[PDB]
Assembly symmetry: C3
Homo-oligomer: 189 residues x 3
Protein backbone atom coordinates (compact mmCIF):
# COMPACT_ATOMS: atom_id res chain seq x y z
CA UNK A 1 0.00 0.00 0.00
CA UNK A 2 1.71 3.20 -1.46
CA UNK A 3 5.14 1.40 -1.41
CA UNK A 4 6.18 1.13 -5.15
CA UNK A 5 7.43 4.12 -7.23
CA UNK A 6 8.35 3.00 -10.81
CA UNK A 7 8.52 3.49 -14.65
CA UNK A 8 6.01 0.68 -15.24
CA UNK A 9 6.93 -3.02 -15.89
CA UNK A 10 7.82 -2.62 -19.62
CA UNK A 11 8.14 1.10 -20.52
CA UNK A 12 8.25 2.74 -23.98
CA UNK A 13 11.52 4.65 -24.85
CA UNK A 14 11.74 7.09 -21.88
CA UNK A 15 15.50 7.64 -21.44
CA UNK A 16 18.22 9.56 -23.40
CA UNK A 17 21.77 8.03 -23.49
CA UNK A 18 23.36 9.79 -26.53
CA UNK A 19 24.58 13.30 -25.62
CA UNK A 20 22.75 16.01 -27.53
CA UNK A 21 19.81 13.79 -28.59
CA UNK A 22 16.37 15.42 -28.08
CA UNK A 23 14.15 12.29 -28.01
CA UNK A 24 14.39 8.97 -26.03
CA UNK A 25 16.78 6.29 -27.40
CA UNK A 26 16.42 3.70 -24.60
CA UNK A 27 13.92 2.11 -22.19
CA UNK A 28 14.82 2.51 -18.51
CA UNK A 29 12.96 0.19 -16.08
CA UNK A 30 13.40 1.57 -12.54
CA UNK A 31 11.42 0.15 -9.55
CA UNK A 32 11.77 1.64 -6.03
CA UNK A 33 10.04 -0.34 -3.26
CA UNK A 34 9.73 0.99 0.35
CA UNK A 35 10.68 -1.80 2.83
CA UNK A 36 11.17 -0.51 6.37
CA UNK A 37 13.97 2.05 6.66
CA UNK A 38 15.41 1.03 3.24
CA UNK A 39 14.35 1.19 -0.47
CA UNK A 40 14.75 -2.03 -2.54
CA UNK A 41 15.75 -0.92 -6.06
CA UNK A 42 15.58 -2.76 -9.42
CA UNK A 43 17.09 -1.32 -12.62
CA UNK A 44 17.43 -2.53 -16.22
CA UNK A 45 18.22 -0.66 -19.48
CA UNK A 46 17.15 -1.68 -23.05
CA UNK A 47 18.49 0.07 -26.16
CA UNK A 48 15.96 1.73 -28.52
CA UNK A 49 18.20 3.38 -31.22
CA UNK A 50 20.94 2.30 -33.67
CA UNK A 51 23.50 4.34 -31.64
CA UNK A 52 22.71 2.56 -28.30
CA UNK A 53 22.34 -0.86 -30.03
CA UNK A 54 25.88 -0.59 -31.59
CA UNK A 55 27.76 0.60 -28.46
CA UNK A 56 28.83 -3.02 -27.72
CA UNK A 57 30.82 -3.17 -31.03
CA UNK A 58 33.54 -1.70 -28.69
CA UNK A 59 35.34 -3.54 -25.85
CA UNK A 60 35.37 -0.42 -23.57
CA UNK A 61 31.98 1.31 -23.03
CA UNK A 62 30.45 3.52 -20.28
CA UNK A 63 26.65 4.09 -20.10
CA UNK A 64 25.41 6.89 -17.80
CA UNK A 65 21.88 7.55 -16.51
CA UNK A 66 21.43 10.66 -14.29
CA UNK A 67 18.24 11.12 -12.22
CA UNK A 68 17.52 14.45 -10.47
CA UNK A 69 14.56 14.86 -8.09
CA UNK A 70 12.82 17.89 -6.55
CA UNK A 71 11.94 18.32 -2.79
CA UNK A 72 8.88 15.99 -3.13
CA UNK A 73 10.85 13.22 -4.93
CA UNK A 74 9.68 14.06 -8.47
CA UNK A 75 11.94 13.68 -11.55
CA UNK A 76 13.22 16.97 -13.06
CA UNK A 77 12.89 15.88 -16.76
CA UNK A 78 14.85 18.80 -18.28
CA UNK A 79 18.14 17.73 -16.62
CA UNK A 80 17.49 14.00 -15.93
CA UNK A 81 18.24 11.15 -18.45
CA UNK A 82 14.67 9.84 -17.69
CA UNK A 83 12.22 12.14 -19.50
CA UNK A 84 9.00 10.91 -17.77
CA UNK A 85 8.34 11.02 -13.99
CA UNK A 86 7.98 7.85 -11.97
CA UNK A 87 4.49 6.78 -10.82
CA UNK A 88 2.97 4.85 -7.87
CA UNK A 89 1.82 1.26 -8.60
CA UNK A 90 -1.78 2.16 -7.53
CA UNK A 91 -1.59 5.90 -8.68
CA UNK A 92 -2.51 12.21 -9.42
CA UNK A 93 -0.91 14.39 -6.62
CA UNK A 94 1.51 12.72 -4.03
CA UNK A 95 4.91 13.24 -2.27
CA UNK A 96 7.58 10.66 -3.19
CA UNK A 97 10.03 12.08 -0.58
CA UNK A 98 9.97 8.74 1.32
CA UNK A 99 11.49 6.95 -1.75
CA UNK A 100 14.50 9.35 -1.88
CA UNK A 101 18.10 8.58 -0.75
CA UNK A 102 18.68 9.92 2.85
CA UNK A 103 20.74 13.16 2.97
CA UNK A 104 21.80 12.03 6.48
CA UNK A 105 23.29 8.71 5.23
CA UNK A 106 24.32 10.12 1.80
CA UNK A 107 25.12 13.87 2.29
CA UNK A 108 26.19 16.50 -0.26
CA UNK A 109 29.88 17.41 -0.34
CA UNK A 110 30.63 20.87 1.07
CA UNK A 111 33.64 22.95 -0.16
CA UNK A 112 36.68 22.40 2.22
CA UNK A 113 34.90 19.61 4.16
CA UNK A 114 36.02 16.68 2.03
CA UNK A 115 34.23 14.16 -0.22
CA UNK A 116 31.53 11.56 0.82
CA UNK A 117 32.65 8.19 -0.58
CA UNK A 118 29.87 6.41 1.41
CA UNK A 119 27.38 7.52 -1.33
CA UNK A 120 28.43 4.90 -3.86
CA UNK A 121 26.94 1.43 -4.29
CA UNK A 122 29.03 -0.91 -6.50
CA UNK A 123 27.86 -4.17 -8.00
CA UNK A 124 27.64 -6.17 -11.20
CA UNK A 125 25.19 -7.16 -13.94
CA UNK A 126 25.64 -8.81 -17.37
CA UNK A 127 25.20 -8.47 -21.11
CA UNK A 128 24.29 -11.70 -22.97
CA UNK A 129 25.82 -11.26 -26.46
CA UNK A 130 24.07 -12.39 -29.67
CA UNK A 131 26.41 -15.46 -29.80
CA UNK A 132 25.56 -16.40 -26.20
CA UNK A 133 28.78 -15.12 -24.52
CA UNK A 134 28.26 -13.50 -21.11
CA UNK A 135 30.00 -10.19 -20.39
CA UNK A 136 30.08 -8.61 -16.90
CA UNK A 137 29.10 -4.94 -16.49
CA UNK A 138 30.52 -3.07 -13.50
CA UNK A 139 27.76 -0.95 -11.94
CA UNK A 140 28.20 2.28 -9.89
CA UNK A 141 25.17 3.89 -8.19
CA UNK A 142 25.97 7.37 -6.79
CA UNK A 143 23.45 8.84 -4.31
CA UNK A 144 23.32 12.66 -3.65
CA UNK A 145 26.88 13.59 -3.70
CA UNK A 146 26.98 16.56 -6.00
CA UNK A 147 24.02 18.50 -7.39
CA UNK A 148 23.70 19.56 -11.04
CA UNK A 149 21.93 22.91 -10.24
CA UNK A 150 19.86 25.01 -7.73
CA UNK A 151 16.56 23.15 -8.58
CA UNK A 152 17.66 19.65 -7.41
CA UNK A 153 17.13 18.19 -3.88
CA UNK A 154 18.16 14.49 -4.52
CA UNK A 155 20.48 12.67 -6.97
CA UNK A 156 20.55 9.05 -8.20
CA UNK A 157 23.00 8.14 -11.02
CA UNK A 158 23.79 4.78 -12.70
CA UNK A 159 26.92 3.83 -14.61
CA UNK A 160 27.32 0.53 -16.49
CA UNK A 161 30.96 -0.15 -17.51
CA UNK A 162 32.08 -2.72 -20.03
CA UNK A 163 35.79 -3.45 -19.87
CA UNK A 164 36.30 -6.58 -22.04
CA UNK A 165 39.26 -8.20 -23.81
CA UNK A 166 37.14 -8.56 -26.97
CA UNK A 167 34.04 -6.69 -28.24
CA UNK A 168 30.72 -8.47 -27.44
CA UNK A 169 29.33 -7.74 -30.97
CA UNK A 170 30.34 -7.17 -34.64
CA UNK A 171 26.78 -6.01 -35.58
CA UNK A 172 23.69 -4.20 -34.16
CA UNK A 173 22.03 -6.21 -31.34
CA UNK A 174 19.49 -4.95 -28.76
CA UNK A 175 21.42 -3.63 -25.76
CA UNK A 176 20.01 -5.22 -22.55
CA UNK A 177 21.67 -4.91 -19.12
CA UNK A 178 20.52 -7.88 -16.90
CA UNK A 179 18.50 -6.81 -13.75
CA UNK A 180 20.66 -5.01 -11.13
CA UNK A 181 19.28 -4.83 -7.56
CA UNK A 182 20.51 -2.50 -4.77
CA UNK A 183 19.32 -1.05 -1.41
CA UNK A 184 19.72 2.35 0.25
CA UNK A 185 18.67 4.15 3.46
CA UNK A 186 15.53 6.18 2.51
CA UNK A 187 14.47 9.73 3.52
CA UNK A 188 11.51 10.35 5.94
CA UNK A 189 7.98 9.94 4.37
CA UNK B 1 0.95 -11.87 6.06
CA UNK B 2 0.11 -13.93 2.84
CA UNK B 3 3.48 -12.67 1.38
CA UNK B 4 5.85 -15.74 1.54
CA UNK B 5 5.56 -18.75 -0.81
CA UNK B 6 8.30 -21.28 0.03
CA UNK B 7 9.67 -24.91 0.31
CA UNK B 8 10.21 -24.50 4.07
CA UNK B 9 13.42 -23.40 5.89
CA UNK B 10 15.18 -26.80 5.75
CA UNK B 11 13.29 -29.16 3.35
CA UNK B 12 13.66 -32.95 2.95
CA UNK B 13 14.92 -34.19 -0.49
CA UNK B 14 12.32 -32.59 -2.84
CA UNK B 15 14.21 -31.96 -6.10
CA UNK B 16 15.57 -34.31 -8.87
CA UNK B 17 18.91 -33.32 -10.56
CA UNK B 18 20.02 -36.62 -12.22
CA UNK B 19 18.25 -37.23 -15.55
CA UNK B 20 16.09 -40.35 -15.48
CA UNK B 21 15.95 -40.60 -11.64
CA UNK B 22 12.44 -41.20 -10.24
CA UNK B 23 12.97 -40.06 -6.60
CA UNK B 24 14.48 -36.83 -5.08
CA UNK B 25 18.31 -36.59 -4.89
CA UNK B 26 18.64 -32.99 -3.62
CA UNK B 27 17.07 -30.43 -1.25
CA UNK B 28 15.96 -27.20 -2.93
CA UNK B 29 15.29 -24.23 -0.58
CA UNK B 30 13.27 -21.62 -2.51
CA UNK B 31 11.68 -18.58 -0.77
CA UNK B 32 9.52 -16.09 -2.74
CA UNK B 33 8.51 -12.95 -0.81
CA UNK B 34 6.01 -10.34 -2.16
CA UNK B 35 7.39 -6.80 -1.63
CA UNK B 36 5.46 -4.16 -3.57
CA UNK B 37 5.54 -4.71 -7.34
CA UNK B 38 8.53 -7.13 -7.04
CA UNK B 39 9.20 -10.63 -5.56
CA UNK B 40 12.37 -11.00 -3.39
CA UNK B 41 13.77 -14.49 -4.08
CA UNK B 42 16.20 -16.68 -2.07
CA UNK B 43 17.55 -20.00 -3.43
CA UNK B 44 20.02 -22.65 -2.18
CA UNK B 45 20.58 -26.30 -3.27
CA UNK B 46 21.97 -29.17 -1.09
CA UNK B 47 22.94 -32.59 -2.50
CA UNK B 48 21.13 -35.68 -1.16
CA UNK B 49 22.60 -38.58 -3.26
CA UNK B 50 26.05 -40.02 -4.12
CA UNK B 51 25.58 -38.83 -7.75
CA UNK B 52 24.91 -35.15 -6.76
CA UNK B 53 27.57 -35.23 -3.98
CA UNK B 54 30.30 -36.37 -6.49
CA UNK B 55 29.49 -33.89 -9.31
CA UNK B 56 32.24 -31.53 -8.02
CA UNK B 57 34.92 -34.20 -8.74
CA UNK B 58 34.79 -32.48 -12.22
CA UNK B 59 36.10 -29.01 -13.14
CA UNK B 60 33.10 -28.28 -15.49
CA UNK B 61 29.60 -28.86 -14.04
CA UNK B 62 26.10 -27.51 -14.88
CA UNK B 63 23.19 -28.02 -12.42
CA UNK B 64 19.66 -27.34 -13.78
CA UNK B 65 16.42 -26.90 -11.82
CA UNK B 66 13.23 -26.32 -13.90
CA UNK B 67 10.01 -25.06 -12.24
CA UNK B 68 6.71 -25.02 -14.17
CA UNK B 69 3.58 -23.40 -12.69
CA UNK B 70 -0.12 -23.53 -13.59
CA UNK B 71 -2.43 -20.43 -13.99
CA UNK B 72 -2.78 -20.09 -10.15
CA UNK B 73 0.99 -20.29 -9.51
CA UNK B 74 1.07 -23.95 -8.43
CA UNK B 75 4.01 -26.30 -9.27
CA UNK B 76 3.30 -28.93 -11.99
CA UNK B 77 5.29 -31.79 -10.28
CA UNK B 78 5.30 -34.20 -13.24
CA UNK B 79 7.46 -31.85 -15.40
CA UNK B 80 9.26 -29.76 -12.71
CA UNK B 81 12.54 -30.62 -10.94
CA UNK B 82 10.72 -29.77 -7.63
CA UNK B 83 8.40 -32.67 -6.84
CA UNK B 84 6.41 -30.96 -4.02
CA UNK B 85 4.37 -27.73 -4.39
CA UNK B 86 5.40 -24.54 -2.58
CA UNK B 87 3.36 -23.46 0.45
CA UNK B 88 2.40 -20.20 2.20
CA UNK B 89 4.14 -19.54 5.60
CA UNK B 90 0.63 -19.88 7.17
CA UNK B 91 -1.90 -22.46 5.71
CA UNK B 92 -6.59 -23.55 -1.20
CA UNK B 93 -5.54 -20.06 -2.58
CA UNK B 94 -3.97 -18.43 -5.68
CA UNK B 95 -0.17 -17.97 -5.83
CA UNK B 96 -0.53 -15.98 -9.12
CA UNK B 97 0.84 -12.83 -7.38
CA UNK B 98 4.21 -14.64 -6.78
CA UNK B 99 4.67 -15.47 -10.51
CA UNK B 100 7.07 -13.70 -12.96
CA UNK B 101 5.18 -10.99 -15.00
CA UNK B 102 4.39 -12.07 -18.59
CA UNK B 103 4.43 -8.33 -19.43
CA UNK B 104 8.03 -7.79 -18.21
CA UNK B 105 9.15 -11.38 -19.12
CA UNK B 106 7.08 -12.40 -22.20
CA UNK B 107 7.12 -15.68 -24.13
CA UNK B 108 9.17 -15.75 -27.35
CA UNK B 109 6.80 -15.80 -30.37
CA UNK B 110 7.81 -17.83 -33.53
CA UNK B 111 8.86 -15.16 -36.04
CA UNK B 112 11.58 -12.67 -35.08
CA UNK B 113 12.41 -12.32 -31.37
CA UNK B 114 14.23 -13.65 -28.30
CA UNK B 115 13.37 -11.94 -24.96
CA UNK B 116 16.87 -11.71 -23.46
CA UNK B 117 15.35 -9.41 -20.78
CA UNK B 118 14.03 -12.66 -19.16
CA UNK B 119 17.44 -13.59 -17.71
CA UNK B 120 18.87 -12.72 -14.30
CA UNK B 121 22.62 -13.45 -13.95
CA UNK B 122 24.60 -13.48 -10.73
CA UNK B 123 27.01 -15.47 -8.63
CA UNK B 124 27.13 -17.78 -5.61
CA UNK B 125 29.84 -20.09 -4.19
CA UNK B 126 30.80 -23.64 -3.28
CA UNK B 127 33.09 -24.00 -0.20
CA UNK B 128 35.16 -27.12 -0.95
CA UNK B 129 36.17 -29.66 1.76
CA UNK B 130 39.77 -28.22 1.68
CA UNK B 131 38.35 -24.72 2.37
CA UNK B 132 38.88 -23.24 -1.17
CA UNK B 133 36.04 -21.10 -2.43
CA UNK B 134 34.76 -21.70 -5.97
CA UNK B 135 32.40 -19.26 -7.75
CA UNK B 136 29.23 -20.60 -9.40
CA UNK B 137 27.78 -18.58 -12.27
CA UNK B 138 23.98 -18.42 -11.79
CA UNK B 139 21.35 -17.97 -14.57
CA UNK B 140 17.62 -17.52 -13.80
CA UNK B 141 15.23 -17.71 -16.78
CA UNK B 142 11.75 -16.36 -16.30
CA UNK B 143 9.01 -17.43 -18.75
CA UNK B 144 10.51 -17.07 -22.38
CA UNK B 145 9.53 -20.69 -23.46
CA UNK B 146 6.85 -23.14 -22.21
CA UNK B 147 7.58 -26.90 -21.94
CA UNK B 148 3.95 -27.86 -22.86
CA UNK B 149 0.23 -26.82 -23.10
CA UNK B 150 -0.34 -27.21 -19.29
CA UNK B 151 2.18 -24.52 -18.15
CA UNK B 152 1.43 -20.79 -17.58
CA UNK B 153 4.76 -19.64 -15.91
CA UNK B 154 8.42 -20.77 -15.98
CA UNK B 155 11.31 -20.30 -13.50
CA UNK B 156 14.61 -22.12 -14.17
CA UNK B 157 17.97 -22.06 -12.28
CA UNK B 158 21.39 -23.00 -13.62
CA UNK B 159 24.53 -23.17 -11.44
CA UNK B 160 27.77 -23.37 -13.55
CA UNK B 161 31.16 -24.40 -12.31
CA UNK B 162 33.95 -23.67 -14.80
CA UNK B 163 37.17 -24.11 -12.82
CA UNK B 164 40.82 -24.76 -13.73
CA UNK B 165 40.80 -27.60 -11.19
CA UNK B 166 38.15 -29.82 -9.59
CA UNK B 167 36.91 -28.68 -6.13
CA UNK B 168 36.92 -32.30 -4.79
CA UNK B 169 38.66 -35.71 -5.12
CA UNK B 170 35.97 -37.45 -2.94
CA UNK B 171 32.25 -37.30 -2.03
CA UNK B 172 31.36 -34.09 -0.13
CA UNK B 173 27.86 -32.61 0.44
CA UNK B 174 27.08 -30.29 -2.48
CA UNK B 175 25.92 -26.87 -1.10
CA UNK B 176 25.43 -23.74 -3.25
CA UNK B 177 25.72 -20.59 -1.03
CA UNK B 178 22.47 -18.45 -0.83
CA UNK B 179 21.64 -16.66 -4.10
CA UNK B 180 19.19 -13.70 -3.94
CA UNK B 181 17.35 -12.12 -6.89
CA UNK B 182 14.28 -9.92 -7.63
CA UNK B 183 11.74 -9.86 -10.45
CA UNK B 184 8.61 -7.91 -11.50
CA UNK B 185 5.63 -10.03 -10.22
CA UNK B 186 2.27 -10.82 -11.86
CA UNK B 187 -1.03 -9.25 -10.57
CA UNK B 188 -2.49 -10.86 -7.35
CA UNK C 1 5.71 -1.16 11.39
CA UNK C 2 8.17 -2.88 13.93
CA UNK C 3 10.01 -4.24 10.82
CA UNK C 4 13.43 -2.42 10.99
CA UNK C 5 16.09 -3.25 13.67
CA UNK C 6 19.15 -1.00 13.08
CA UNK C 7 22.16 1.06 14.32
CA UNK C 8 20.68 4.29 12.88
CA UNK C 9 21.36 5.77 9.39
CA UNK C 10 24.67 7.42 10.33
CA UNK C 11 25.94 6.12 13.71
CA UNK C 12 28.70 7.55 15.93
CA UNK C 13 31.74 5.25 16.58
CA UNK C 14 30.01 2.11 17.97
CA UNK C 15 32.33 -0.75 16.91
CA UNK C 16 35.78 -2.05 17.96
CA UNK C 17 38.07 -3.51 15.21
CA UNK C 18 41.56 -3.27 16.86
CA UNK C 19 42.17 -6.18 19.28
CA UNK C 20 42.63 -5.00 22.85
CA UNK C 21 41.08 -1.53 22.29
CA UNK C 22 38.54 -0.49 24.98
CA UNK C 23 36.67 2.28 23.06
CA UNK C 24 35.02 2.32 19.58
CA UNK C 25 37.31 2.88 16.56
CA UNK C 26 34.75 2.42 13.75
CA UNK C 27 31.15 3.13 12.75
CA UNK C 28 29.10 0.03 11.89
CA UNK C 29 25.83 0.66 9.96
CA UNK C 30 23.69 -2.50 10.21
CA UNK C 31 20.04 -2.54 9.04
CA UNK C 32 17.84 -5.63 9.48
CA UNK C 33 14.42 -5.45 7.79
CA UNK C 34 11.71 -8.17 8.25
CA UNK C 35 10.20 -9.11 4.86
CA UNK C 36 8.12 -12.29 5.01
CA UNK C 37 10.09 -15.36 6.10
CA UNK C 38 13.44 -13.60 5.39
CA UNK C 39 15.44 -10.63 6.83
CA UNK C 40 16.83 -8.12 4.25
CA UNK C 41 20.22 -6.98 5.59
CA UNK C 42 22.38 -3.92 4.77
CA UNK C 43 25.91 -3.48 6.18
CA UNK C 44 28.64 -0.82 5.82
CA UNK C 45 31.74 -0.08 7.96
CA UNK C 46 33.52 3.33 8.30
CA UNK C 47 36.86 3.79 10.07
CA UNK C 48 37.03 6.15 13.08
CA UNK C 49 40.68 5.82 14.30
CA UNK C 50 44.20 6.25 12.84
CA UNK C 51 44.73 2.43 13.15
CA UNK C 52 41.57 1.54 11.13
CA UNK C 53 42.17 4.43 8.62
CA UNK C 54 45.73 3.17 7.82
CA UNK C 55 44.89 -0.58 7.44
CA UNK C 56 44.69 -0.13 3.64
CA UNK C 57 48.42 0.89 3.52
CA UNK C 58 48.79 -2.96 3.26
CA UNK C 59 47.80 -5.15 0.27
CA UNK C 60 46.46 -7.97 2.55
CA UNK C 61 43.89 -6.99 5.21
CA UNK C 62 41.09 -8.91 7.08
CA UNK C 63 38.40 -6.98 9.03
CA UNK C 64 36.21 -8.97 11.48
CA UNK C 65 32.95 -7.91 13.13
CA UNK C 66 31.35 -10.43 15.58
CA UNK C 67 27.77 -9.93 16.80
CA UNK C 68 26.36 -12.06 19.65
CA UNK C 69 22.65 -11.90 20.61
CA UNK C 70 20.66 -13.11 23.63
CA UNK C 71 17.37 -15.18 23.49
CA UNK C 72 15.33 -11.99 22.68
CA UNK C 73 17.68 -10.84 19.88
CA UNK C 74 19.58 -8.21 21.90
CA UNK C 75 23.33 -7.51 21.40
CA UNK C 76 25.65 -8.80 24.17
CA UNK C 77 28.05 -5.77 24.13
CA UNK C 78 30.80 -7.32 26.30
CA UNK C 79 31.65 -10.00 23.69
CA UNK C 80 30.34 -8.33 20.46
CA UNK C 81 32.34 -5.96 18.20
CA UNK C 82 29.25 -3.62 18.29
CA UNK C 83 29.20 -1.94 21.70
CA UNK C 84 25.64 -0.48 21.50
CA UNK C 85 22.44 -2.53 21.01
CA UNK C 86 20.36 -2.22 17.85
CA UNK C 87 17.03 -0.34 18.07
CA UNK C 88 13.69 -0.28 16.20
CA UNK C 89 13.35 2.52 13.58
CA UNK C 90 9.96 3.56 15.01
CA UNK C 91 9.41 1.94 18.51
CA UNK C 92 13.37 -0.01 24.20
CA UNK C 93 11.32 -2.79 26.03
CA UNK C 94 10.88 -5.06 22.92
CA UNK C 95 11.79 -8.60 21.62
CA UNK C 96 13.94 -8.81 18.48
CA UNK C 97 13.85 -12.66 18.17
CA UNK C 98 12.11 -12.41 14.77
CA UNK C 99 15.15 -10.56 13.32
CA UNK C 100 17.53 -13.44 14.30
CA UNK C 101 19.04 -16.08 11.93
CA UNK C 102 16.96 -19.35 12.05
CA UNK C 103 18.62 -22.15 14.08
CA UNK C 104 16.61 -24.56 11.86
CA UNK C 105 18.14 -23.24 8.58
CA UNK C 106 21.52 -22.31 10.20
CA UNK C 107 22.15 -24.89 12.95
CA UNK C 108 25.00 -25.05 15.53
CA UNK C 109 27.75 -27.69 14.91
CA UNK C 110 27.96 -30.67 17.24
CA UNK C 111 31.31 -32.13 18.41
CA UNK C 112 32.41 -35.03 16.04
CA UNK C 113 29.43 -34.52 13.65
CA UNK C 114 30.90 -32.42 10.91
CA UNK C 115 30.16 -28.74 10.24
CA UNK C 116 27.19 -26.85 8.73
CA UNK C 117 28.55 -25.09 5.65
CA UNK C 118 24.93 -23.85 4.83
CA UNK C 119 25.67 -21.16 7.43
CA UNK C 120 27.76 -18.94 5.20
CA UNK C 121 26.77 -16.15 2.83
CA UNK C 122 29.61 -15.01 0.47
CA UNK C 123 29.64 -11.88 -1.66
CA UNK C 124 31.59 -8.79 -2.62
CA UNK C 125 31.82 -5.08 -1.89
CA UNK C 126 34.45 -2.40 -2.68
CA UNK C 127 36.87 0.14 -1.28
CA UNK C 128 37.18 3.35 -3.36
CA UNK C 129 40.80 4.48 -2.86
CA UNK C 130 41.73 8.21 -2.36
CA UNK C 131 42.97 8.21 -6.03
CA UNK C 132 39.67 6.69 -7.27
CA UNK C 133 40.97 3.11 -7.68
CA UNK C 134 38.39 0.52 -6.93
CA UNK C 135 39.46 -2.49 -4.87
CA UNK C 136 37.18 -5.52 -4.34
CA UNK C 137 36.58 -6.83 -0.81
CA UNK C 138 35.58 -10.48 -0.43
CA UNK C 139 32.72 -10.67 2.16
CA UNK C 140 31.84 -13.71 4.39
CA UNK C 141 28.74 -13.72 6.68
CA UNK C 142 28.58 -16.69 9.17
CA UNK C 143 25.26 -16.72 11.22
CA UNK C 144 25.19 -19.77 13.57
CA UNK C 145 27.98 -22.20 13.44
CA UNK C 146 29.37 -21.85 16.99
CA UNK C 147 28.51 -20.01 20.22
CA UNK C 148 31.29 -17.95 22.00
CA UNK C 149 29.85 -18.71 25.51
CA UNK C 150 26.83 -19.89 27.65
CA UNK C 151 25.09 -16.44 27.42
CA UNK C 152 24.66 -16.36 23.58
CA UNK C 153 21.63 -17.67 21.62
CA UNK C 154 22.44 -16.28 18.07
CA UNK C 155 25.59 -15.35 16.08
CA UNK C 156 26.17 -13.03 13.09
CA UNK C 157 29.76 -12.37 11.95
CA UNK C 158 31.20 -10.32 9.02
CA UNK C 159 34.61 -10.60 7.39
CA UNK C 160 35.89 -8.15 4.75
CA UNK C 161 39.07 -9.42 2.95
CA UNK C 162 41.43 -7.38 0.83
CA UNK C 163 43.85 -9.56 -1.12
CA UNK C 164 45.44 -7.14 -3.58
CA UNK C 165 48.83 -7.19 -5.34
CA UNK C 166 49.42 -3.60 -4.30
CA UNK C 167 48.23 -1.36 -1.45
CA UNK C 168 45.18 0.92 -1.98
CA UNK C 169 46.80 3.77 0.00
CA UNK C 170 50.21 5.33 0.95
CA UNK C 171 48.56 7.68 3.53
CA UNK C 172 45.64 7.83 6.06
CA UNK C 173 42.26 7.85 4.29
CA UNK C 174 38.80 7.12 5.82
CA UNK C 175 38.14 3.38 5.54
CA UNK C 176 34.69 2.81 3.94
CA UNK C 177 33.38 -0.60 2.76
CA UNK C 178 30.68 0.03 0.03
CA UNK C 179 27.13 -1.20 1.03
CA UNK C 180 26.82 -5.01 1.17
CA UNK C 181 23.28 -6.51 1.04
CA UNK C 182 22.28 -10.06 1.99
CA UNK C 183 19.18 -12.11 3.03
CA UNK C 184 18.68 -14.97 5.48
CA UNK C 185 15.84 -17.17 6.79
CA UNK C 186 14.67 -15.48 10.07
CA UNK C 187 13.61 -17.06 13.40
CA UNK C 188 9.92 -17.02 14.55
CA UNK C 189 8.62 -13.63 15.96
Amino acid sequence: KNNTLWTGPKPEANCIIEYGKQNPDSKLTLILVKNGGIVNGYVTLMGASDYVNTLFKNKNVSINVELYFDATGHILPDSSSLKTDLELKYKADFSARGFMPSTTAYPFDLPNAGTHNENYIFGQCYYKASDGALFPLEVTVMLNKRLPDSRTSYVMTFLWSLNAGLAPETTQATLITSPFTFSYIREDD
